[PDB]
Design a binder for this molecule. Structure first.
Ligand SMILES: C[C@@](CCn1ccc(-c2ccc(-n3nccn3)cc2)cc1=O)(C(=O)NO)S(C)(=O)=O
Ligand SMILES: C[C@@](CCn1ccc(-c2ccc(-n3nccn3)cc2)cc1=O)(C(=O)NO)S(C)(=O)=O
Ligand SMILES: [Cl-]
Ligand SMILES: [Zn+2]
Ligand SMILES: [Zn+2]
Length: 300
């Protein structure tokens, strides 16, 4: 059959705290009709404020990706969006009782598991993909983010931390999703930050919810998490996870390749804005036969 749009098969509920705000938050994911996209809804507000998870609604990009509308925000959307992108969810309502998505364990793992426990539902409309037709590159300072045409979906990233826990380690990684599992090899990679910064971050209402329970906390010369890392390259794999979530603000799955060098949320969003504006560089495609497409998805 054709590759169909997907939504949730059942309502998902989760509770947690915002990484940056520390606020308790209830998250509810609900099915949504064809061509809705992913839409966040601040249900603590009346009337609610609904913000489509789209590049045009990105306000702040300092320490997380934040959506804004009116006076209102939804902070830290990237890890949830990474899970929804990795599982191929097109349409969903994401209700939140506070201004920040819960951080869970710092990775996309818990969201992936909650979604896959609920199940996905195919819908009676073709899934639309954005295919990169021409290279699009943005740079600022020593940072670079690029889309290049590629028959599939592939994400590469390089970091360069002047820090003794990072020097001599694997700071580059490349994942081609024709051969590597998002679920197994990317989704579990946790966010990370530095003990040196915590008093300063908190003085700015950042990382107020952060701890070893939801982040890899790096001290001056060692990782503080007593149970260790999930991947030897967990840091760069988390940057790949972040990039997948930020890229999903295009609103559709990508057929193309992303390469990041010290990119973060701000440059990722600048890349999306430049791609969207360079309409010669992309097109929207659908697949009447899943067998012949360059990307394939797990059973729903
Ligand atoms: C079969 C296999 C891999 C399956 N697959 C397929 C697609 C994606 C994927 C993830 C993100 C995006 N995207 N983000 C932003 C925009 N678009 C697009 C596609 C992830 C994945 O995992 C598997 O087993 N998965 O468990 S495989 C044999 O390659 O291991
Ligand atoms: C932007 C980014 C990272 C986001 N982040 C994550 C964790 C912390 C953090 C820092 C210190 C502690 N802590 N100190 C003592 C005890 N606990 C706990 C958590 C700070 C932060 O800013 C990201 O993942 N965005 O999605 S990242 C990897 O791209 O730089
Ligand atoms: Cl950046
Ligand atoms: Zn992150
Ligand atoms: Zn052009």
């Amino acid at each position: 059959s054709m590759i169909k749009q997907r939504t949730l098969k059942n309502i998902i509920r989760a509770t947690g705290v915002g990484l940056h705000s520390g606020e308790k938050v209830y998250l509810t994911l609900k099915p949504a009709p064809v061509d809705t996209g992913i839409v966040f809804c601040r249900t603590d507000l009346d009337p609610v404020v609904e913000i489509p998870a789209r590049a045009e609604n990105v306000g702040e990009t300092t320490m997380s990706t934040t959506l804004v509308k009116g006076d209102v925000k939804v902070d830290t959307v990237e890890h949830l969006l990474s899970a929804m992108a990795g599982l191929g969810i097109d349409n969903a309502y994401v209700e939140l009782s506070a201004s920040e998505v819960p951080i869970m364990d710092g990775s996309a793992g818990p969201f992936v598991f909650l979604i896959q426990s609920a199940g996905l539902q195919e819908q009676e409309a073709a899934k639309k993909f954005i295919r990169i037709k021409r290279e699009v590159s943005v740079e600022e300072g020593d940072k670079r983010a690029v889309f290049v045409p590629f028959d599939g979906f592939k994400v590469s990233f390089e970091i360069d931390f002047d820090h003794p826990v990072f020097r001599g380690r694997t700071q580059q990684a490349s994942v081609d999703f024709s051969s590597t599992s998002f679920v197994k090899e990317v989704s579990r990679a946790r966010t990370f930050g530095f003990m040196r910064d915590i008093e300063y971050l908190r003085s700015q209402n950042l990382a107020l919810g952060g701890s070893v329970e939801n982040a890899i906390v790096v001290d001056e010369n060692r990782v503080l998490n007593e149970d260790g890392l999930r991947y030897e390259d967990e840091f760069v794999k988390h940057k790949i996870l972040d990039a997948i979530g930020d890229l999903y603000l295009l609103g559709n799955s990508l057929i193309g390749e992303f390469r990041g060098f010290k990119s973060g949320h701000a440059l990722n969003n600048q890349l999306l804005r430049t791609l969207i504006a360079d309409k010669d560089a992309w097109e929207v495609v659908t697949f009447e036969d899943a067998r012949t497409a360059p990307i394939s998805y797990m059973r729903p």
